[PDB]
Structure formats: C-alpha cells, structure tokens
C-alpha cells in the first residue's frame, strides 16, 4: 500500500526516452516526491511495465486514484494500480 505500478508503458527512441521517466516525476510531483523508480526490460528489449515507490502510503494510494491511465495520445491507455 506504499507503491504504484503502471501497465501498457512501451519504450521510445532517443530525444524522448528521458521524458518517459522525467514526466513521471512532474505528474507525480503534485501528490508529493518520488523516492524510488525502476524501469525493468525483457532480454534487453522494449518493456511494457514500470515500478515506482513513494516515501508514504498516502502518496501511493493517492497517485493510483489520480493518474489512473495517462493520456500520451498514441493507441491504448495505461492502467495505474
């Protein structure tokens, strides 16, 4: 109850890959400050999921209920749980 997870999060090319984790810090900054951030992969290839942990339960349990599906304007929405 102190962490968040997202789904349908593919990688992107250069000049934008940074934005992927950067925008995470900006969007989640209104609820508090993120302390833990992990971006796993499959055989060194394109991921689809990430793992973020907050310094408090009230940040995670809030963020999940505030950022439920990001609007990246691509194809399919995300699922923050």
């Amino acid at each position: 109850d102190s962490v968040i997870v997202v789904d349908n999060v593919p990688q992107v090319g250069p000049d934008r890959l940074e934005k992927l984790k950067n925008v995470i810090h900006k969007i989640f900054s209104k609820f508090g400050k993120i302390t833990n951030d992990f971006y796993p992969e499959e055989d060194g290839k394109t991921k689809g999921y990430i793992f973020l942990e907050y310094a408090s339960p009230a940040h995670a349990v809030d963020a999940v209920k505030n950022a439920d599906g990001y609007k990246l304007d691509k194809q399919h929405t995300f699922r923050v749980n």
């Binding site: 950022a67 990001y70 990246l72």
Partner: peptide, 11 residues
Amino acid sequence: DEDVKDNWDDD
C-alpha cells in the same frame, strides 16, 4: 516534462 499540457494523467 516542460511548460505544456499535462498529456500524461487522465482526470
């Protein structure tokens, strides 16, 4: 990331 629309959080 910058001063633009929050196109990363569906209300």
